[PDB]
From Swiss-Prot, chain A:
This is DNA-directed RNA polymerase II subunit RPB1. Residues 24-36 are annotated as: Lid loop. The C-terminal domain (CTD) serves as a platform for assembly of factors that regulate transcription initiation, elongation, termination and mRNA processing. Belongs to the RNA polymerase beta' chain family. The chain holds residues 225 to 280 of 1733 of the full protein. The tandem 7 residues repeats in the C-terminal domain (CTD) can be highly phosphorylated. The phosphorylation activates Pol II. Phosphorylation occurs mainly at residues 'Ser-2' and 'Ser-5' of the heptapeptide repeat. The phosphorylated form of Pol II appears to carry, on average, one phosphate per repeat. The phosphorylation state is believed to result from the balanced action of site-specific CTD kinases and phosphatases, and a 'CTD code' that specifies the position of Pol II within the transcription cycle has been proposed. Component of the RNA polymerase II (Pol II) complex consisting of 12 subunits. Interacts with DEF1; the interaction is direct and serves to bridge RPB1 to the Elongin complex in a DNA-damaged dependent manner. Interacts with the Elongin subunit ELA1. Interacts with the Elongin subunit ELC1. Interacts with ASK10. Interacts with ESS1. Interacts with RTT103. Interacts with SHE2. It is found in: Nucleus.
Curated annotation (Swiss-Prot), chain B:
Associates with TFIID-IIA (DA complex) to form TFIID-IIA-IIB (DAB-complex) which is then recognized by polymerase II. General factor that plays a major role in the activation of eukaryotic genes transcribed by RNA polymerase II. It is found in: Nucleus. Belongs to the TFIIB family. This is Transcription initiation factor IIB. A zinc finger (TFIIB-type) spans 1-33. It comes from Saccharomyces cerevisiae (strain ATCC 204508 / S288c). Present with 6750 molecules/cell in log phase SD medium. Zn(2+) binds at C4, C7, C25, C28.
From Swiss-Prot, chain C:
Signal peptide: none annotated. DNA-dependent RNA polymerase catalyzes the transcription of DNA into RNA using the four ribonucleoside triphosphates as substrates. Second largest component of RNA polymerases II which synthesizes mRNA precursors and many functional non-coding RNAs. Proposed to contribute to the polymerase catalytic activity and forms the polymerase active center together with the largest subunit. Pol II is the central component of the basal RNA polymerase II transcription machinery. It is found in: Nucleus. Belongs to the RNA polymerase beta chain family. Component of the RNA polymerase II (Pol II) complex consisting of 12 subunits. This is DNA-directed RNA polymerase II subunit RPB2. The binding of ribonucleoside triphosphate to the RNA polymerase II transcribing complex probably involves a two-step mechanism. The initial binding seems to occur at the entry (E) site and involves a magnesium ion coordinated by three conserved aspartate residues of the two largest RNA Pol II subunits. Present with 18700 molecules/cell in log phase SD medium.
Curated annotation (Swiss-Prot), chain D:
GO terms for cellular component: core mediator complex; mediator complex; nucleus. This is Mediator of RNA polymerase II transcription subunit 18. It is found in: Nucleus. It comes from Saccharomyces cerevisiae (strain ATCC 204508 / S288c). Component of the Mediator complex, which is composed of at least 21 subunits that form three structurally distinct submodules. The Mediator head module contains MED6, MED8, MED11, SRB4/MED17, SRB5/MED18, ROX3/MED19, SRB2/MED20 and SRB6/MED22, the middle module contains MED1, MED4, NUT1/MED5, MED7, CSE2/MED9, NUT2/MED10, SRB7/MED21 and SOH1/MED31, and the tail module contains MED2, PGD1/MED3, RGR1/MED14, GAL11/MED15 and SIN4/MED16. The head and the middle modules interact directly with RNA polymerase II, whereas the elongated tail module interacts with gene-specific regulatory proteins.
Length: 56, 35, 49, 253
C-alpha cells in the first residue's frame, strides 16, 4: 500500500523507544531499582550503536 | 503532597487502606486516591 | 417412636484430611492492583481476584 | 433531636432602632424581650477515656450546654425600674458592665443540649446542624445541684455567658433573633459583641429524613434573605467555626 505499507519501511532506520509504563521498574527500596529486561536490551542496543558510530 | 479538600488541616492526617486500595482521611472519612 | 427399618451400626476408622474450609474461603470487593497490567493480583493470602 | 437550618449576620447598634421598625413592617408582630444563661461543660481531663476507639474513631469527645432563663430583676439596676419592660431597654445595654456578676451565678449553681459540626459539602445554601436535646425538671438527694450532677456524669465547668435580645416570630415557624452576649468571669464581665447586635434567623425540622419539608424550609430561608437585600447581608458562617469538639478549641461569638 502507498500510504500505510510501503516496502522501504520494512528496513529499520530509527527505533522507537517505549515509555516506562511498558517497562516498569520495581523499586524495593529508595535506592533499590530492579529494571526490566527490555530496558537492558535497549541500553545494549544504544551502546553498540555508539560503538559503531565512533568506529565509523 | 496530598491534602483533604474539606478539613483543610495541616499537616494532613491520612491512613492508607491497602486491603481496599484506598487512601482515606482519618477525620472526615473522605477517600482521596484509589487503586 | 420406633423406626420401621433397622440400621447397620458399628465402629470404623476415620482420618481427618488436610483440607479445611477455613483455608479455602475467599472474597474480594476491591483491593491492590498490578504494577504492569493494573489488574487484580493473584493469591488468596494477597486478597486477589 | 432536630435539624436546625440557620443563617447569620451582624449589625451596628446605630441602625438598631431603624432595623426594629422594618421588621415590624414585614412580620406584622412586635418584638418580645427575652434573656438566657448558658453554661458550657467539658469532659474531665483527670479521667483517661481510653474508650475512645482510636483505631476506628467511633466517637470523639464533645461539650455539653446547659441553659436556663433568669428573671429581669437580676439584670435591672436601681436606675431602670422607671422605664417599662420593653425592647428599648436594650439601648442602654452598651457598657461592658452588667448587674449580674460572678457571685450570683455561682450562687445559682434547665435544658441540656449537644450538637455536631454542620454537614460537609459546598452544595449547601444554609447552615444545617444536628441537635440532641433533653430537659432537667428537678432533683433531690444530699447533693442536689447542677454542679454535682454534671460532676457525677463526668463533666466539669468551662465557662459561661449571658444573652439578652429580642425575638421575632414570622410565618412557617421562622424565628429571628437579635442578641447581645456578655462573657462573665470572676475578673469581670466583658461584652464580646461590642457595639453591635448579632442577628440569627433559623428554623427547626423535627425529622431529618423528610426531605420535602427540608426543601420547603430552605426555600423560606432563602426568600427571607432575598427580602432583606441591601439592608443586611445574611450569610452562611464558617463550617469550621461551629465545631464544638474538645480536641480543637474555638468558639463562634
Amino acid at each position: 500500500n502507498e500510504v500505510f505499507s510501503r516496502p522501504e519501511w520494512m528496513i529499520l532506520t530509527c527505533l522507537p523507544v517505549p515509555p516506562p509504563p511498558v517497562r516498569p521498574s520495581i523499586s524495593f527500596n529508595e535506592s533499590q531499582r530492579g529494571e526490566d529486561d527490555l530496558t537492558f536490551k535497549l541500553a545494549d542496543i544504544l551502546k553498540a550503536n555508539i560503538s559503531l558510530e565512533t568506529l565509523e | 503532597v496530598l491534602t483533604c479538600p474539606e478539613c483543610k488541616v495541616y499537616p494532613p492526617k491520612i491512613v492508607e487502606r491497602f486491603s481496599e486500595g484506598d487512601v482515606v482521611c482519618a477525620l472526615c472519612g473522605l477517600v482521596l486516591s484509589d487503586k | 417412636k420406633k423406626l420401621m427399618a433397622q440400621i447397620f451400626f458399628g465402629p470404623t476408622y476415620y482420618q481427618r484430611l488436610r483440607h479445611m474450609v477455613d483455608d479455602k474461603i475467599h472474597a474480594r470487593a476491591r483491593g491492590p492492583m498490578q504494577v504492569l497490567t493494573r489488574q487484580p493480583v493473584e493469591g488468596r493470602s494477597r486478597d486477589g481476584g | 433531636m432536630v435539624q436546625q437550618l440557620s443563617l447569620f449576620g451582624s449589625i451596628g447598634d446605630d441602625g438598631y432602632d431603624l432595623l426594629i421598625s422594618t421588621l415590624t413592617t414585614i412580620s406584622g408582630n412586635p418584638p418580645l424581650l427575652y434573656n438566657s444563661l448558658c453554661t458550657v461543660w467539658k469532659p474531665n481531663p483527670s479521667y483517661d477515656v481510653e474508650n475512645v476507639n482510636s483505631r476506628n474513631q467511633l466517637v470523639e469527645p464533645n461539650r455539653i450546654k446547659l441553659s436556663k432563663e433568669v428573671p429581669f430583676s437580676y439584670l435591672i439596676d436601681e436606675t431602670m425600674m422607671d422605664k417599662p419592660l420593653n425592647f428599648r431597654i436594650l439601648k442602654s445595654f452598651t457598657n461592658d458592665k452588667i448587674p449580674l456578676n460572678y457571685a450570683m451565678t455561682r450562687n445559682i449553681l434547665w435544658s441540656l443540649q449537644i450538637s455536631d459540626i454542620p454537614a460537609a459539602g459546598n452544595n449547601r445554601s444554609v447552615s444545617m446542624q444536628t441537635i440532641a436535646e433533653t430537659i432537667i425538671l428537678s432533683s433531690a438527694g444530699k447533693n442536689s445541684s447542677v454542679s454535682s450532677l454534671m460532676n457525677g456524669l463526668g463533666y466539669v465547668f468551662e465557662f459561661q455567658y449571658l444573652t439578652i435580645g429580642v425575638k421575632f416570630f414570622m410565618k412557617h415557624g421562622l424565628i429571628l433573633e437579635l442578641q447581645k452576649i456578655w462573657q462573665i468571669e470572676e475578673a469581670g464581665n466583658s461584652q464580646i459583641t461590642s457595639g453591635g447586635f448579632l442577628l440569627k434567623a433559623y428554623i427547626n425540622v423535627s425529622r431529618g429524613t423528610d426531605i420535602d419539608r427540608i426543601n420547603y424550609t430552605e426555600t423560606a430561608l432563602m426568600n427571607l434573605k432575598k427580602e432583606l437585600q441591601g439592608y443586611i447581608e445574611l450569610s452562611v458562617p464558617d463550617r469550621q467555626s461551629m465545631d464544638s469538639r474538645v480536641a480543637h478549641g474555638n468558639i463562634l461569638i
